[PDB]
Amino acid sequence: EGAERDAVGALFEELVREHRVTGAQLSVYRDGALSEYATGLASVRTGEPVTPRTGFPFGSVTKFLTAELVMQFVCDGDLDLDDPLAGLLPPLGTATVRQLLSHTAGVVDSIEYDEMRGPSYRRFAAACARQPALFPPGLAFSYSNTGYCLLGAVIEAASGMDWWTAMDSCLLRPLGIEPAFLHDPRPGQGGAARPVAEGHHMASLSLAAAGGLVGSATDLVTAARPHLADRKTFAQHDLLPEDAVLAMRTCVPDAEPFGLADGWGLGLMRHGTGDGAWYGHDGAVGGASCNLRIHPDRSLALALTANSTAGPKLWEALVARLPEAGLDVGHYALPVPDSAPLAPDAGHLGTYANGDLELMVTHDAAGDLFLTRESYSDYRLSLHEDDLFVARSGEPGALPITGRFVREHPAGPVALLQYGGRAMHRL
């Protein structure tokens, strides 16, 4: 196996050059032992090198950790997975903790809340109540940062600790992870600050439970250790029982995360089907990207952190090449529509919204359909079979969109527009 681990480092280092990555970490747990590759600089500004201790923004990969912390309370009886929120916090009250974890509660992606100034998530839960639901809870998938900030408020209500203090004391420190955040509102105590990589977002106090953690590839792989077939070899596996781990990778049915993944569990997404299924999470904060992938049956976990804007393309080039060391990480691909533009059903015209994001489906006088947005270019919209759509903006700077429409009933009209993992309610 010593030559496989060599291969990965050769490939890793060569891909960080070819995508001109300032600094990166890659950690791999495989065949019962850990490989840690760290390269480049934590800051060009200062010349300090990346080491495996350097903190990188996790961004939305925080969700996998917030999910694990929430599962801990489900296992300690302190919180129920499948019964209404309205019992735990002052429409939304019919959503369950299980739905928020799988992005099926119908919460919008982003509700602005600049007003949060401290560690409590109480006042944030109030402004969420004031907000329209994308759909009835359970109807479909729609990725939501705000849903995971709601879990920060559930955790705080479930235990008695703010989300930060529960993250640190129930999950992070028992795993030997040095706690580190984009923003910590607590006075805290002293001690050297953990070295962190800069990445010139979810830099905003209310987004913490959804995107605020900071850490290394090795921390993420360590948080993956309870999820593995060989979990009993991990001395802290007790922190996440075999049944919470199983629930975390059990995908919600009848809710395809269209555009992001084949399926979603509780804080883990799925790419692939059977023996080729991988689980994990992606994130990005400015110049920093983060990916975590887990093959539980093979007891495999890898995580990449990178503080350059090629971070997404480094990750994709790493997935395309990692097979050259036997790591066939699952892939997600949008479906290419098989057909030709279908008769522009006008039962599709209207305004689709997710919070403050807004599209309009219009026609022009020739009858073709368009997808417009505030300070975007217009797209030509083509309807296809299975309610698929492609939207093309002839301009090369603006990528095409593959989406789909969603009806609440097989006889009803189009209710949801869905792409990139987000749904947008027809107004």
Ligand X SMILES: *C(=O)[C@H](N)CC(C)C
Which positions touch ligand X (CB under 6 A)? 59-60, 145, 202, 211, 260, 282-284
Residue 308 binding result from Y ion, ligand X, none, given CB thresholds of 5 to 8 Å by partner type? none
CA-wise closest residue to 41 among 158, 248, 196 = 196
Whose Cβ is closer to Y ion: residue 1's or residue 112's?
112
Instruction: Please name which of 287, 164, 298, 176 lies closest in space to residue 229, comparing C-alpha atoms.
Output: 298
DSSP state of 121: -
Which range binds Y ion by CB under 5 A, 77-85, 89-97, 289-297, 376-384? 77-85
Min dist CB 87 to Y ion, Å, is 8
10 Å CB burial of residue 178 (0-12, 13-18, 19+) is middle
Distance (Å, whole) CA 326 – CA 304: 17
Cα angle, residue 265 at apex, residues 259 and 269 outer, rounded to 5°: 40
Q: Which does 272 bind (CB under 5 to 8 A by kind): ligand X, Y ion, none?
A: none
How far from 280 is each of 96, 194, 203, 221, 290, CA to CA, in Å? 22, 25, 22, 11, 11
Beta carbon of residue 125, minimum distance to ligand X (angstroms, whole number): 20
Beta carbon of residue 115, minimum distance to Y ion (angstroms, whole number): 5
**359 contact choice in ligand X, Y ion, none (CB below 5 to 8 Å, kind-dependent):** none
Shortest Å, Cβ 340 to Y ion: 46
State which amino acid sits at residue 51: T
- Min. distance of Cβ 267 from Y ion in angstroms? 21
Pairing relation of β-strands 214-215 and 263-264?
unpaired
Neighbouring CB atoms inside 10 A of 328's CB total 14
Min separation Cβ 351 and ligand X, Å? 23
Closest distance to Y ion from the beta carbon of 211 (Å): 19
Q: Of 97 and 202, which CB lies nearer to ligand X in the complex structure?
A: 202
Ranges of H-type helices in 46-168: 62-75, 97-101, 122-129, 145-158, 163-167
Residue 359 C-beta: closest distance to ligand X, Å = 17
68 binds, among Y ion, ligand X, none (CB under 5 to 8 A by kind): none
CB of 345 to ligand X, least distance (A): 29
Residue 341 tokens read as 């533009």
Give 8 or 268: the residue with its C-beta nearer to ligand X.
268
Closest residue to ligand X in the complex (CB): 60
Instruction: Identify the helix (H) or strand (E) that includes residue 370.
Output: strand 369-372
Using CB under 5 A as the binding rule, whether residue 78 contacts Y ion is answered as no
- Report what 213 binds from Y ion, ligand X, none; CB cut-off 5-8 Å by kind: none
Quick one: what does residue 282 bind among ligand X, Y ion, none, with the CB cut-off 5 to 8 Å set by partner type? ligand X
Nearest distance, CB of residue 308 and ligand X, angstroms = 16
Which one, 40 or 211, has the nearer CB to ligand X? 211
Which does residue 265 touch among Y ion, ligand X, none (CB within 5 to 8 A, set by kind)?
none
**Distance between CA 81 and CA 83 in Å, rounded?**
6
Of the pair 72, 145, the CB lying nearest ligand X is at 145
Contact criterion met (CB below 8 Å) for 270 and 277: yes
Residue 156: name its binding partner from Y ion, ligand X, none (Cβ under 5 to 8 Å by kind).
none
Q: What is the 3-state secondary structure (H, E, C) of 49-72?
A: ECCCCCEEECHHHHHHHHHHHHHH
Size of the site for Y ion (CB under 5 A): 2
Q: Which does 13 bind (CB under 5 to 8 A by kind): ligand X, Y ion, none?
A: none
Site string for Y ion, 79-98 (x = CB under 5 A): -x--x---------------
Q: From residue 388, how far is each of 154, 342, 384, 391, 414 by CA, in Å?
A: 36, 10, 5, 10, 12
**Roughly what angle, to the nearest 10 degrees, separates helices 145-158 and 62-75?**
30
| 83, interface contact from ligand X, Y ion, none, CB < 5-8 Å by kind | Y ion
Cα 104 to Cα 95: distance, rounded to the nearest angstrom: 9
Q: What x/- string results for residues 209 through 248 when contact with Y ion is judged by CB under 5 A?
A: ----------------------------------------
At 271, is the secondary structure helix, strand, or coil?
strand
Do strands 288-295 and 300-306 pair parallel, antiparallel, or not at all (unpaired)?
antiparallel
The secondary element (H helix, E strand) that includes residue 14 is helix 2-18
Which stretches of the chain bind Y ion, using CB under 5 A? 80, 83
